[PDB]
Hints:
Layout lengths: L8 H6 L14 H13 L6 H14 L8 H17 L6 H13 L9 H7 L2 H5 L4 H14 L12 H17 L2 H16 L8 H16 L7 H24 L16 H23 L4 H18 L4
Helix pairs in contact: 2-4, 3-8, 4-5, 4-11, 5-9, 8-9, 9-11, 10-11, 10-13, 11-13, 13-14
The protein binds the ligand CNC(=O)c1cc2[nH]c(-c3ccccc3)nc2cc1NC(=O)c1nc(C)ccc1C, magnesium ion and zinc ion (ZN).
Zinc ion (ZN) binds next to helix 4.
Amino acid sequence: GLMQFTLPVRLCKEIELFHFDIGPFENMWPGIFVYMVHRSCGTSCFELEKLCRFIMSVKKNYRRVPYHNWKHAVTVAHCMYAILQNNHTLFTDLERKGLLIACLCHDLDHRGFSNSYLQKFDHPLAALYSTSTMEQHHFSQTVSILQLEGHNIFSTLSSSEYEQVLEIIRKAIIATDLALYFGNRKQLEEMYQTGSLNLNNQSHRDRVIGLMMTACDLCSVTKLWPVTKLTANDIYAEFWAEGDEMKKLGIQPIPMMDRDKKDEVPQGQLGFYNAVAIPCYTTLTQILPPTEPLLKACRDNLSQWEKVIRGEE
Ligand SMILES: CNC(=O)c1cc2[nH]c(-c3ccccc3)nc2cc1NC(=O)c1nc(C)ccc1C
Ligand SMILES: [Mg+2]
Ligand SMILES: [Zn+2]
């Protein structure tokens, strides 16, 4: 009850900023996450005996892959933390509880391969869930860990509060399927421009929570340049690995994943910032003005990639 977590001063200050990096010390990430729940939700939201055992179970069910790892789960969780703290009064008690757990769980038991690669491999998980394949799996694995003796961090919720929080988490994890992002942003775009966006419309909060999740999951591109650049290596190490496995199934992989076309990479970063990253945080900024620092950071980094091409690094 009376046991706060307390970070070193530099972390105590930087963590509140959007562009904070959670650092190379694995053992401090659970403290960081727990810190963010207490400040975001209340000291009282979850039993600490139980939260700690849910954290360490989730930590274990992320694999040792180059990008889609435990450091991603906490990084994404942190960016939602920043969004929630800068939009204090826009979100229910339940949404703040469910959304931080969603982000920590959003990529559970990821193997470093796209939904596309699962379908062309004929992995079983592709037979079991035709669309948003990894994403239905991640939610699945989330409800597993919630149901281990001693891991139900929600058991003090009422029947119907519990039913709402599991429904928030599911939509949130499904919304991380980038394939559904493009359609979701467009609807939110029209709704904000035609003035029809209504945050008490539940189907509308859903859409907005969808965009938030996309923005947190892409937040790699919203860090200072040297974090963005070094993360790109991790992202591309999975992509080229999947390309290698595409080639083993006798398919030429798309250039994004072909290690032979590293040269074309800076240009592929341009298309990505232009087609996905910039729009995402633009639309987010319009709906949630306090999230403008993400948009600014993303633009600074688009500008760093333009330099990489122009020979200037
Ligand atoms: C949907 N589209 C994308 O995700 C994309 C497409 C690309 N095409 C090329 C490319 C390369 C060499 C030659 C031609 C083309 N690089 C690409 C990188 C991409 N994404 C990320 O970097 C990326 N993806 C996530 C989910 C989080 C962060 C990042 C930073
Ligand atoms: Mg994912
Ligand atoms: Zn992710």
